[PDB]
């Protein structure tokens, strides 16, 4: 393959030599006759001297050693100096590679080339499966779905990982190899283009492996957030937020907790009047929710006493009711009550018409972000806008958090320990730099995993519960991966410094990396290909045919 190219250049140098050497005049003196000694071209040389010619150009590393020379002793006899079998002898110490002929036994060699084909397919089968899944998700009528957009970026990380290994293998097959005895000798040397490419590939690969667990952390946070209840607390928490010390607002009041007010004139020790009362003793999520839990019931009470707002509240489902309560929380009974045509539409179950009517007002102008999430809640009737708010965070805890660790690790590697393709066994920076964030991710994925089971018992015991419900269906995918991947990558690294290479360690190596190669299809299958919703949309697109 790669040796065949070198063989043609070597041969060419050989013909170029024989042709060069023919045109020179015969020698008057007794010299070592000119020869191509299989390595370089050598002129007639006087006896008792060491001739020289620059390092032959056919060598893959010619440019690095073009300034260097090979030498050859012409012996007292008039004959060149030979080696033990009478072969040509020279000193090409200078021209020698910056690498090693690593000899690999016939049966160990055939074995690694067999077990290489296993991992090359596993990743390619995970590649086609991931890129099909992306073609299924992104090309189609889930075009703007928030739940899929997390899956899509997970799949892209596993596409990155998989893509990086194929590049690396493809570059390590460049390596020059030949049959020396029964052993196969493989050269460590790689060309500068081949060095750079596989280095970048290794960074991408290390960035992918941190991104995988950062995007499986997002997949777990998703269910934890998505499945909390969800409540009006979290809604008004995302719309406004929690606080404990007071601060001034648009009107200049003691605003505290979640959109609550303590006093009526601008004062601090007079704001204490209501703060001592509602606790009733001598500021927390255990304490100061008591302020928010009065304000909701007060807002709910006021809505029932308001004649324009009550039959709209009555007519609405539980989740859209929380959206109306929100609107009052912001404005009040009187303000909301004056959305007379928008209200009429929500009472009539005309959500898309209400939504366009609400956006036309000077509420959506004064707060385009909050009004947009509230209007969506009316539009659709789920907590989707508030799940979506957390997405832009999850992009930067899926992509940016790996980049915070690895890119400086890529800078570190460059300046200290600069091997051709970085899969090093040093342990100084593949523990702290690249393994710490995957450990810290798995750590948080475990604290969540248990918090999901307590969250799913509470869901399934209440009336929010059925088994064919997509929220439970999606937990069948996520709750399998965190134990599958969390075990497989900590038991690996825990026991990855125990054997020297080895025969049992290299047998361990292949049982693990073959599971890791199909890892990118497993994910593609249980999320994308096994989803009910996606299976039905294929049965709609394929049945229009």
């Amino acid at each position: 393959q790669v040796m065949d190219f070198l063989f043609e250049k070597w041969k060419l140098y050989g013909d170029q030599c024989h042709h060069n050497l023919s045109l020179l005049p015969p020698p008057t003196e007794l010299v070592c006759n000119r020869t191509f000694d299989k390595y370089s071209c050598w002129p007639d040389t006087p006896a008792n001297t060491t001739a020289n010619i620059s390092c032959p150009w056919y060598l893959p590393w010619h440019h690095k050693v073009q300034h260097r020379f090979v030498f050859k002793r012409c012996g007292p006899d008039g004959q060149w100096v030979r080696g033990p079998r009478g072969q040509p002898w020279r000193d090409a110490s200078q021209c020698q590679m910056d690498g090693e002929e690593i000899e690999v036994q016939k049966e160990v060699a055939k074995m690694y080339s067999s077990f290489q084909v296993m991992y090359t397919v596993g990743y390619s089968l995970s590649l086609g499966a991931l890129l099909l899944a992306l073609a299924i998700l992104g090309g189609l009528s889930k075009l703007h779905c928030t739940r899929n957009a997390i899956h899509a970026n997970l799949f892209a990380s596993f596409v990155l990982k998989a893509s990086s290994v194929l590049v690396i293998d493809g570059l390590l097959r460049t390596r020059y190899s030949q049959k020396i005895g029964d052993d196969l000798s493989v050269s460590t040397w790689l060309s500068d283009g081949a060095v750079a490419g596989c280095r970048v590939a290794a960074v991408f690969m290390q960035y992918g492996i941190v991104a995988n667990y950062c995007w499986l952390l997002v997949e777990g946070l998703y269910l934890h957030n998505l499945l909390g209840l969800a409540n009006i607390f979290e809604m008004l928490r995302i719309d406004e937020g929690l606080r404990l010390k007071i601060y001034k607002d648009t009107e200049g009041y003691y605003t505290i907790g979640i959109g609550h007010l303590l006093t009526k004139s601008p004062s601090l020790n007079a704001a204490k009047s209501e703060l001592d009362k509602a606790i009733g003793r001598n500021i927390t999520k255990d304490e100061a929710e008591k302020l928010f839990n009065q304000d909701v019931d007060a807002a709910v009470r006021g809505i029932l006493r308001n004649a324009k707002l009550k039959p709209v509240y009555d007519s609405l489902d539980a989740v859209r009711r929380a959206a109306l309560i929100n609107m009052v929380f912001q404005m009040g009974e009187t303000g909301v009550a004056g959305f007379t045509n928008s209200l009429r539409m929500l009472q009539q179950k005309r959500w898309d018409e209400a939504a366009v009517n609400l956006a036309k007002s000077r509420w959506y102008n004064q707060t385009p972000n909050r009004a947009k999430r509230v209007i969506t809640t009316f539009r659709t009737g789920t907590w989707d806008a508030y799940e979506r708010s957390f997405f832009s965070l999850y992009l930067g805890i899926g992509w940016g958090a790996p980049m915070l660790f690895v890119v400086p690790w890529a800078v570190v590697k460059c300046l200290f320990e600069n091997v051709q393709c970085w899969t090093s066994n040093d342990n100084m920076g593949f523990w702290w730099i690249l393994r710490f964030p995957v450990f810290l991710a798995i750590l948080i994925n475990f604290f969540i995993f248990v918090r999901i089971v307590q969250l799913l018992v509470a869901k399934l015991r209440a009336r929010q519960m059925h088994h064919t419900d997509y929220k439970f269906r999606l937990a069948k995918s996520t709750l399998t991966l965190i134990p599958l991947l969390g075990v497989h990558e900590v038991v690996f690294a825990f026991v990855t410094d125990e054997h020297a290479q080895g025969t049992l360690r290299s047998a361990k190596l292949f049982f693990d990396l073959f599971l890791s190669s199909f890892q990118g299809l497993l994910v593609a299958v249980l999320y994308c290909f096994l989803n009910k919703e996606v299976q039905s949309e294929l049965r709609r697109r394929w049945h229009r045919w």
Partner: antibody
Amino acid sequence: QVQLVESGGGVVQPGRSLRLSCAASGFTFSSYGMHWVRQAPGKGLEWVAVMYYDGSNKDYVDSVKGRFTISRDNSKNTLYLQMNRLRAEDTAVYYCAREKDHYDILTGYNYYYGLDVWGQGTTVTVSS
Amino acid sequence: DIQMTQSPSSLSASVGDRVTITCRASQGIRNDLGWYQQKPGKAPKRLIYAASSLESGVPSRFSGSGSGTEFTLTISSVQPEDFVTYYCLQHNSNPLTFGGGTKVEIKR
């Protein structure tokens, strides 16, 4: 089918000459080094000469240097041993063997695997 | 010149016996050694190559071991066909040199 057939042997007188021949079949003759080895009647094996494809590289045992000459016709897949100025001590059975070598282009070093396949032998007998 | 000393010249065994022809070298010939068997009247046949690497279709009784300067051929269970002559050959330097040879005679 890899085999080597010698011929040329027979009775010859001290001082006169003989060209033994060794005929390769079943393999690529050009790529293998080749060797003659003799074994005198009572005694054991004795290497006598080698020749490689080039064939700049050639060698002989001391007792036959200048007296004996090795050659090969790659077109006829034949190896030869021109024996001149024969003495009594050249009385022997003359085997021909091949050696496989390997050149490492990346290092310019050569590896040698020894005499794997041998001829049947041709008796040479030097008597007046 | 690398002198190869073959020990012993003749040895006496019975079918079954473990037999150990050794063969020493006057310099470091590395692993470049091969063991031949010569049957009476027949051209020698090579058994071990590269010191220990058994040739194709040679019984597993035969085994080679040694490196640098000490080299050992070993038949674990000498059969009737093995009572013949054996030589080491060195191919590390010209002139290629043999050991003196070892006749394995049948004890009685």
